Amino acid sequence: SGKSYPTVSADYQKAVEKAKKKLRGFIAEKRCAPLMLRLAWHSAGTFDKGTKTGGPFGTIKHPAELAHSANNGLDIAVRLLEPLKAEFPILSYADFYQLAGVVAVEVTGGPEVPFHPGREDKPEPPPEGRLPDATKGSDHLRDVFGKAMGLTDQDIVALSGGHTIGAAHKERSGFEGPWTSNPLIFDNSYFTELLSGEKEGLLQLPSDKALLSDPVFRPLVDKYAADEDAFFADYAEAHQKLSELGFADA
Numbered sequence: 001s002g003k004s005y006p007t008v009s010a011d012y013q014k015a016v017e018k019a020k021k022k023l024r025g026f027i028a029e030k031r032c033a034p035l036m037l038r039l040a041w042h043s044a045g046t047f048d049k050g051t052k053t054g055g056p057f058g059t060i061k062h063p064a065e066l067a068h069s070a071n072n073g074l075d076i077a078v079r080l081l082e083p084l085k086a087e088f089p090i091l092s093y094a095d096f097y098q099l100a101g102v103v104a105v106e107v108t109g110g111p112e113v114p115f116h117p118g119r120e121d122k123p124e125p126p127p128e129g130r131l132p133d134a135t136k137g138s139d140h141l142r143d144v145f146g147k148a149m150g151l152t153d154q155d156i157v158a159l160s161g162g163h164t165i166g167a168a169h170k171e172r173s174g175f176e177g178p179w180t181s182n183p184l185i186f187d188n189s190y191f192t193e194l195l196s197g198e199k200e201g202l203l204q205l206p207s208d209k210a211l212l213s214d215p216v217f218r219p220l221v222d223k224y225a226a227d228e229d230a231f232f233a234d235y236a237e238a239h240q241k242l243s244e245l246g247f248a249d250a
């Protein structure tokens with residue numbers, strides 16, 4: 001909603017289609033889908049709607065932004081993608097990273113998130129400190145996703161389901177381990193695990209737990225745990241919105 005996507009050339013569109021295929025094979029073989037989803041999300045999640053700064057405009061590869069503590073480990077993702085990006089010189093880095101995030105979800109068995117090309121790479125990274133803090137709660141989540149990014153409460157809960165793939169690392173954030181028993185499979189298990197309590201060997205952040213005690217978030221957790229199709233629909237909507245923050249008159 002509210003989007004007017006730009007025209008790109010036929011050659012640009014051909015490159016998007018071929019890069020999507022190459023990214024599927026690469027991400028599947030390297031087992032790095034979670035890290036790639038995290039890269040796309042940390043690129044997009046810096047958007048501030050009031051100032052129209054930050055967002056998915058390719059700045060995450062700049063050494064200054066990779067140095068943000070919230071981005072520990074993402075230098076690995078940038079390096080992994082560099083040889084592939086060099087095969088598609090016509091594409092913006094902004095588009096390439098967002099495409100990699102869409103592909104990460106698809107190859108782990110998640111929904112097909114719509115993708116529209118045309119993001120232009122911006123020169124300057126946003127200031128540090130916009131991404132969410134795992135030790136904080138619902139008020140903080142609404143400040144970051146709502147007041148800054150302009151996303152809804154439904155989007156907060158569905159996007160938190162990104163933790164259905166991957167793990168934390170004690171050398172990156174300090175937290176450690178996977179949220180689910182199948183960290184390379186995208187399904188509604190994040191919500192099932194959240195509801196059943198703490199199982200040994202699985203992770204829950206304070207920010208995950210905040211979803212269970214908030215009056216608006218909890219019904220959504222319950223719905224997604226009961227209905228994976230509802231989760232997939234809402235996730236696809238929210239990821240598309242995230243990947244387009246500030247893009248295509250926003």
Ligand code: HEM
Pocket residue numbers: 033034035037038041073132133134135141159160161162163165166167168169170172173174175205207
């Ligand atoms: C809701 C607020 C959120 C907080 C506080 C948060 C925090 C974290 C933290 C602390 C980690 C572990 C980093 C590490 O040690 O390796 C992590 C990993 C991850 N996050 Fe989130 N995150 C949030 C939202 C999201 C969103 C919106 C997405 C994407 C839709 C996402 C996708 C991921 C993925 C896939 C990983 C695993 C990375 C890997 O396996 O290397 N997160 N997050």
Ligand SMILES: O=C1O[C@H]([C@@H](O)CO)C(O)=C1O
Pocket residue numbers: 030031032033034035036076166
């Ligand atoms: O998702 C990830 O992928 C890589 C590695 O496990 C496979 O390349 C990594 O360090 C992650 O956190």
Ligand code: NA
Pocket residue numbers: 164165166180181182183184185186187189
């Ligand atoms: Na999983």
